[PDB]
Symmetry: D2
Subunit: 488 residues, 4 copies
Amino acid sequence: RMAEQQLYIHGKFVAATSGKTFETINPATGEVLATVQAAGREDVDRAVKSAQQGQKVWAAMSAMARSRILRKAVDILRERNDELARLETLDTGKPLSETAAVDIVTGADVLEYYAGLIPALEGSQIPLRDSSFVYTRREPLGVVAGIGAWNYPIQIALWKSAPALAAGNAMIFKPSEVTPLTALKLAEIYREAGLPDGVFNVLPGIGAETGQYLTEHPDIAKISFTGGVASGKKVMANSAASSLKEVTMELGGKSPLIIAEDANLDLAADIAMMANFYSSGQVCTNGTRVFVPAKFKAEFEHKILERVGRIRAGDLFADDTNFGPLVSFPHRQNVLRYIESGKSEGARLLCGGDVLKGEGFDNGAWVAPTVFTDCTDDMTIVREEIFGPVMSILSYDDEAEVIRRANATEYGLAAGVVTPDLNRAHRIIHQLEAGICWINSWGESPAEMPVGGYKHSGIGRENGVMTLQSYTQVKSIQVEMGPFQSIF
Amino acid sequence: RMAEQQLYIHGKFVAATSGKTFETINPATGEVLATVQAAGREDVDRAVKSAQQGQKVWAAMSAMARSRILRKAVDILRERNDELARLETLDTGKPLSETAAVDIVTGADVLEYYAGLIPALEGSQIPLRDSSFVYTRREPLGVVAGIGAWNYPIQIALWKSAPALAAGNAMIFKPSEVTPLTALKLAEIYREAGLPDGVFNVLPGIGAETGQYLTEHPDIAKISFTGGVASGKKVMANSAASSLKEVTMELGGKSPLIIAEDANLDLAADIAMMANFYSSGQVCTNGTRVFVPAKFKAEFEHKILERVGRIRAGDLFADDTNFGPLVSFPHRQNVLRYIESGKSEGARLLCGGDVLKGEGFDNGAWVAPTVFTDCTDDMTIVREEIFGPVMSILSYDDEAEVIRRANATEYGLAAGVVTPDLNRAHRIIHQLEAGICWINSWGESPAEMPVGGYKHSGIGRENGVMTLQSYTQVKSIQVEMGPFQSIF
Amino acid sequence: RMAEQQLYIHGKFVAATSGKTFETINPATGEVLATVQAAGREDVDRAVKSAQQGQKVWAAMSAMARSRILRKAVDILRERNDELARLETLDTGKPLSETAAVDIVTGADVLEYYAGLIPALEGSQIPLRDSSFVYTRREPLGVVAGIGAWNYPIQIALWKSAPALAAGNAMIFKPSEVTPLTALKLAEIYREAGLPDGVFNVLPGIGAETGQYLTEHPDIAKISFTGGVASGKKVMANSAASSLKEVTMELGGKSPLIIAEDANLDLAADIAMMANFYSSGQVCTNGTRVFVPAKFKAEFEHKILERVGRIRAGDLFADDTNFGPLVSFPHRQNVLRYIESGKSEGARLLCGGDVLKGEGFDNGAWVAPTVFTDCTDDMTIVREEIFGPVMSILSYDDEAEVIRRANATEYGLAAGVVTPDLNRAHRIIHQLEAGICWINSWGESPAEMPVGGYKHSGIGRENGVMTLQSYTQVKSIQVEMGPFQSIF
Amino acid sequence: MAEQQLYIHGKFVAATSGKTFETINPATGEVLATVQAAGREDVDRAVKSAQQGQKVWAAMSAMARSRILRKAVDILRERNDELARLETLDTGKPLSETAAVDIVTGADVLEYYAGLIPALEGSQIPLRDSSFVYTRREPLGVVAGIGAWNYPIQIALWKSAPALAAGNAMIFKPSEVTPLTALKLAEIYREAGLPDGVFNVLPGIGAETGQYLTEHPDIAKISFTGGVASGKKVMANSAASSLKEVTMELGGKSPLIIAEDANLDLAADIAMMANFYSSGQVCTNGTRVFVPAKFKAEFEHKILERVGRIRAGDLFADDTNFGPLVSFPHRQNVLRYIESGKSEGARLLCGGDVLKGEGFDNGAWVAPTVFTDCTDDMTIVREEIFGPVMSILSYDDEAEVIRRANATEYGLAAGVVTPDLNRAHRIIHQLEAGICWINSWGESPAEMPVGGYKHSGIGRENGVMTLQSYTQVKSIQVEMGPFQSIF
Ligand SMILES: Cc1cc2nc3c(=O)[nH]c(=O)nc-3n(C[C@H](O)[C@H](O)[C@H](O)COP(=O)(O)OP(=O)(O)OC[C@H]3O[C@@H](n4cnc5c(N)ncnc54)[C@H](O)[C@@H]3O)c2cc1C
């Protein structure tokens, strides 16, 4: 057990005034990791007033002064990488082999990226005529709010807070109630790095209360949300109805992986595995519809079975473990229901499909890596995001067909193609309706690369130079040096 | 009167299948200008399918081919300026002295600007390592919808359709039911210029039906809305609940005009007049809170009274007319309610405050130019947007005070300062919470200059290079040329 | 015969005061096309004072006013395309099948592109602290000079004058003494479109006199030169000694075409043909070193010989003619000297190598399409730019080798690769030391694409957005609103 | 000090020239150090070293390069005082300046560019469904910087920072007057993790070492700071040799325009800072001060009062704010100009002679000097002096002063002092100078591009554009459609 976790407001831990708490569980054992205070409406208002005061100090500093502070936080994150990863593993159930190599490393990469860009944030100047010109300022939005998801807690906290802070804002961050612990550690790290009090406040709580209070508050200028497609629609509605906030949404997907007829099937199988079974399949960008040519389908299935047989579930801190439990028992129940739907709708179960049992598994929400084949576009498992380790294999005959079927979805997050052919790779990718496209790979998300969804998978983008800009608002200023003429 | 006005879908006028119609009234006479068909749910679906087909043809053309077609539309608009202006005056009540000099001229200015920028729309390329790089595409959103307001009907239709079309999209445009006529002429003009069938469709109708059907349609990727704060909040909510659409909102304001202690009061009075009584006060950016130093208030009031006396209401086609009726009789009733509110709360009526009477006015929706003084920050006329010819004059003592009071509003659209002092002009403007700021002038909105609101006055921007980009969506593409490594 | 050609200064033809003239020869017949006046030192001084006056009028116009004038020049160039192409064919010897399809079409494409970009030319704004900010202006250089080459006379005149004019400068253009005629026609076209007098002046003359006088003039702010590597080095030196002018240089190359081991040899042969024998080999970007894998060399040679046999020399105005004489008889003598060196140094002559003979050829400066094989890196024909129809075929064994040999040159203009493999194409191209790189094609130069040389092949770039910016100069302006502190 | 060597490939190495030169302490006349001079063979060795290091450097990730330059920034901040004392010994500038400006703003620029490395991006241009273009911003390769003597280490950092950040190696030739801090910077870069060969330093004289750099066939770009005459030679020899890209930051005769509504205390402070900082050895100095006739007398009085507070003395004393000139030959040239001002009829307001007495007789001191009643034809008004010599000129109306401010072959900087919104922007927009200050002088933020119009320069330094200018664009067309040959 850990000590009781409090709110983080204005550079210090503080008790919530809500009188409410919740528990976060270790998904591998079921033990209570901590009791956590839940922010109420009054706590949210305190956090906003704290953020308004800190934002003014932060914005008044020089650009390089802000850069240096964020870089100090990067340095602390690098030093504490392994410790934070262990905490993330306890809170999420993801293997340490993942968390120590990806979660903090790539979160800190984005913070480090934006820290260096702060001095490059510039407005524009537009000559109109000798006697008048326009210039623009990219001004901070003010106080912004981030709402996190549970699959990559500290990485999401860093990907939202880095551009927000770098753009001169304060952010109030609400982590998922499933995984609140690393966000609180990040808040301390920022303060240690010299971030002014109030610039990064963290309010654990449940979505129906703490999250809603943030989306309704009249002095928060922008909401950035990561989570499911459904929950996203609700947040975006409430943010508009209350105070017309700017919005960013990073939602789920049903992303297609297209294997071309000229692909090497070992490479294609390796990409499909990494696109489906990393983080136990709990990744928004996963390539969960795998399109394979009919002539290669049988051989591809064999190569998938061989690789799935290698997956190593077990002790999450052991080096050779590469597969974990799902984050919770309710989430596994939902994944199990999708698996049962696949069976009842006539998809062929290639492997997996059941809970794991026995010593070391009975206390966690483990599901075996699962692969369905003989899938068709009308099946529930093919149409809906599962957010578990469930691959759907679909046969196709020609390039025009596969593009059509890949695009025939309300989702739009990611896509990829496996082919050695120059023309085929670019030609196919240019026609796919997704924001994140991978050629002969999957999953890499460089700090420089803007990422987000088409269609129901998102609004706006994260990462890249454009996301620094999107956390500012443009003010246009006309200087009229000629004599003003009134017609009255 | 005109013949029953039909919908415009796929390069031709077509009858609505809704069985519903509405009337547009000439606000100068009360007569019916035309009966207009209202697009039904099935009509909207037809328009979307038409737009999808046209967008594909349009996007497949070269960038310069798109530029030439928009440039031909510009040429037709310049040629037909006077004819279109006369129709706009009939539909809106704005004097021909305005519509023939501003509405089409500045609408076409924006179309001409975006036509030339089409070839400069570029993605990026990012080296990761010798064996991998990223490039981005700025892809069309697809089909977008624009929903217009009634104060600048054809100008709004051009400011929305120009960046949308230039970015490679098709737009379905719903004009205000108050002023539907010039949008239909624009649709014909675009087709005459060579715009492919379906790329610009126009669907008259009422907001609760035709507008909502557009905000709900699953195949429309973005909604751009101009109108009131209230209706915007509804539009943004329904667009989210339906299909998670990207959104732009240009709403109203209560913009402050700050007269500095060193301002020339003849200039300040001229700016205040142009910021309040152009288009009979029906301009979202109007500077309807005029802050004047206490020591200058009496002299400024005298200068305003003098200039108000020069306003020339009359025949909207007469050369010397520079003031018109309001857009509709229901709108006049709301403006009269605000005026009575000002009287009942004790604001001092300096001039106006009643309808115009006599030959040539009894049949039009005329409100006299009205000025209230001795106003305070809590009065209803000071807090709420009136959208009529009602100036509120507020006394103030010092610079810090006036900046706070200017900013103490949920609105955020525009602001201005009158001062000959270098430091004062930039110092004050940099502290105002508004997207559109004028120094020693008011109202000019160059095609190059991004415009839109802070806080409740808007989401996103129009005009400028940034708005061409905001009608595209970013696709990031990673080319991995090294061997892909799976951990399984 | 044509009338004596005069200088074009300040919107009209005017007599030179040098007392000197020169003749331009029709390379198909040896006849004198025209006597042309040569601008002397005083004529250059007159042209600069004219340009100084016109530049002020031009820069004082609005951006869109300049845009519209250049667009009118585009419209005239489209209408007169065939007439201008016929004159270019008479002056250069290039077939009408080329000049009517490329020279004016792509020249006007660049003018049309930059006309549309004028309003997007913007400076920057940089906040330093609450009390100080910087903004930048992109100001015209003033009077700039362009010095053209003889292979693409009017295209070069357009590619230099379009960005210079669009950026607000006046340009004095000196066409090659070999090909002066179409530049004078362009000057008339600009005046007809509304270009202010003095903004585009044309001074025919010889390089040692008129060209040098321009490079030395103290009131010319920039020189843009297209021509041979040697003459460029001299122009750049003389510009520095005089008044430290900005410089752009587009010089020749010895560009490599790399045929990969997996290439289709018909495609490779087609690309090699277009890279060597268009415009009778007089293209700076030609792929005159063709690297072929040893295993495919014999077959590649056979495919080249088959296509060379199809080349159709003849009447330059006939539709089926696709090969012309060289631009002048002295240039033919130099090409023949290079061919003789190839023979004497042991390269194997596969075809051509002599003048064309018989009726319709004896009086023109014809050289047969020539192909050498078994070439080695030390041969004169492999190391030096020939600027005639002479392909050198070189065998190679592995990818590392061909990259090294492709790069082992002082030239750096263009390069290309023929391969269907995704990784091979990007991997190889990323390692080549050239500014213009083509994958599975050759020769296309879109207006959007910056083009220029590495190493000895050039300084700066033409086309693209960057070249518009390179015809402005940055002024940085700091506004200090805080109290200035002196240490004295 | 010990005899100073070349720095090639991460180590000090003896020169192969057999030649050396001396750097003099301008405060005492003593020899500070004997310095080895790089010969033509040393330059070729430096280039081959740089070619090797650049490939290692460019192959690293962008953030790996960023981190290494940031470590160099951290070392520079820690050793600010040590480097500043060395700079003061070599240049004669007061420690009060070198410890506050030279390294601080040098490191500021390095720190700025370190953060921008990951933002360096090419473009992508769709042509049609079957073809697109993308561009790469590739390193130039090996570039050379040739420095001036007034801000030795700052110039070394302002040239090397964008060059290194863009993925190039730089060979740096410091001025022979002031070679010492550049060698220190080379050690700091290596300590920070910079690959061997990426920053090589070759001391030597301009006529030999500098010329050998401009002539070398494998150097892709030259960045030069110095005088117009040497610049014309550099740019010519760079073209004649191998057609190198060239950037030049030359001198100026920058005008300071005092408006009719200016506060004269503010104007006098700006004129003082624009003329007597670094003993007047600043390229951007506002050495033509235009004052309205109606205020001329009062302005002169305010200038004289501020000149009287100038504190020449021990360059390591806290209150010292004025030093000797960088060298004794430079002083004779400055005295030549001062005597020209006297003989052409300018009125001497103060100064005009060397400083004398204990502690000054052995240093290259020139007193702060002010001329008034100046006219546009005078030599001191037309030519850059690069010493502490202010020229005051009267004017009557705004159009006149703008014409006269612009009537020069120089174009580096300019400024206006006025509280009026319209006057400040209106006048500045009409001045033909690259660096313009309103109600201030001298501040040169890392973000702000700076360089000259007309004879004052080619290209710019600082800002995002200068990072880009140390790359070359490669355009790449991908044709996915079938290629059509007409043959
Ligand atoms: C049954 C019915 C009949 C009506 N008949 C008429 C009539 O005959 N004449 C008339 O002038 N008005 C009519 N209205 C509309 C009414 O006057 C509203 O006040 C309407 O909002 C006025 O639109 P506006 O453009 O003035 O203002 P705003 O409400 O600001 O409208 C701005 C724009 O948004 C659109 N809009 C408004 N609400 C929505 C929404 N919920 N979803 C999408 N788009 C929306 C408007 O149509 C317009 O294009 C009718 C409404 C209903 C429900």
